[PDB]
């Protein structure tokens, strides 16, 4: 019926590749994506100094839910900002309560730990984020490039971002749409 | 001695993944990258509606050369804007005259045709951009994911952007730096 909707939460220090690849691929799949700035409406300085203008502040976007997926990019500093945010905590807890998809990549999954989301799930992260994610043994670790355990979808790094984004597309719009979106990308 | 320098020319309708992946990977390699807005200093609306704030206008950045590489992202409309620009023509002709690297991805190489750059080189493009690039037979076509014929470096699509960016890094900073930058990315 209606198009699916994605909320991508963009914090200072986010990995810009892990932000842009999922936004672009989801839009190719017809998903209505809102890039929401954690700090407000102003441009966001990403980890490698690409500056991205969000579509909306998180403050405004959070009042326009519910979303079919909430997406957490990585970047070490971006994920730390997501992990410290009470607004992010509330959004993720609401998404979990309504059985909606949550997708996080690289260091992004460590914000799930910070907000006590999805405990008892298999997850992956960037190799360098494993110890942080695994503090307390609240998840089971996976080395798969993309991991999905029910409604918790995780992935490892910039180089897994296309696979991550296509897994989101498959979860929301089905395998055929994901395959059709994939072919023009010239993935290996 | 001094750090290498890259000029990335960002036009309305550029493919944002093909802009951000090379910028980020080149910065990981220590290259000083200037994201220069074709139209001026203002934010640029990319093909999938990601909005990127350039570091400088092209008008200003072009006066701060020379650059070790000039990079042309793709996106059908972005490449058409690059192809119509007299400023881009001048920059590319200067870069060719001084035997500097020119790198273009997806539809980006069609701006080389428009500006009569690198004729007689092997090149690749996105499959859907082949006919435009090959009009007149001025290049020899390749299906390699990245193609490099001397100082003309080309590639095929969003899904070849990491390979493209790492090829630029290898050309400017050597194979060892490219390998060191590659490993943390979690490429397949």
UniProtKB/Swiss-Prot annotation, chains A, B:
Modified residues (N6-acetyllysine): 148
Pfam family, one: DJ-1_PfpI
Phenotype upon changing residue 106 to A: Abolishes enzymatic activity. Abolishes oxidation, association with mitochondria and protease activity. No effect on chaperone activity. Reduces binding to OTUD7B. Removes the glycations and restores histone 3
Bilayer topology term: Lipid-anchor
Keywords: Acetylation, Autophagy, Cell membrane, Chaperone, Copper, Cytoplasm, Disease variant, DNA damage, DNA repair, Endoplasmic reticulum, Fertilization, Hydrolase, Inflammatory response, Isopeptide bond, Lipoprotein, Membrane, Mitochondrion, Neurodegeneration, Nucleus, Oxidation, Palmitate, Parkinson disease, Parkinsonism, Phosphoprotein, Protease, RNA-binding, Stress response, Tumor suppressor, Ubl conjugation, Zymogen
One GO cellular component term: synaptic vesicle
Protein's GO biological process: adult locomotory behavior; androgen receptor signaling pathway; autophagy; cellular detoxification of aldehyde; cellular detoxification of methylglyoxal; cellular response to glyoxal; cellular response to hydrogen peroxide; cellular response to oxidative stress
In-chain residues carrying the UniProt-annotated modification Phosphotyrosine: 67
Family according to the record: Belongs to the peptidase C56 family.
The protein's name: Parkinson disease protein 7
């Amino acid at each position: 019926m209606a198009s699916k909707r994605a909320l991508v939460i963009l914090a200072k220090g986010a990995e810009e590749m892990e932000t842009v690849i999922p936004v672009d691929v989801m839009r190719r799949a017809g998903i209505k994506v809102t890039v929401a700035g954690l700090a407000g409406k102003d441009p966001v300085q990403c980890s490698r100094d690409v500056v991205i203008c969000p579509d909306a502040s998180l403050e405004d976007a959070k009042k326009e839910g519910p979303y079919d997926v909430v997406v957490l990019p990585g970047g070490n500093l971006g994920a730390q900002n997501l992990s410290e945010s009470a607004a992010v905590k509330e959004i993720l807890k609401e998404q979990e309560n309504r059985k909606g998809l949550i997708a996080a990549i690289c260091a992004g999954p460590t914000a799930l730990l910070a907000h006590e989301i999805g405990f008892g799930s298999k997850v992956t992260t960037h190799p360098l984020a494993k110890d942080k994610m695994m503090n307390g043994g609240h998840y089971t670790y996976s080395e798969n490039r993309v991991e999905k355990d029910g409604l918790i979808l995780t992935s490892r790094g910039p180089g897994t971002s296309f696979e991550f984004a296509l897994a989101i597309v498959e979860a929301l719009n089905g395998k055929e749409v994901a395959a059709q979106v994939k072919a023009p990308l010239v993935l290996k």
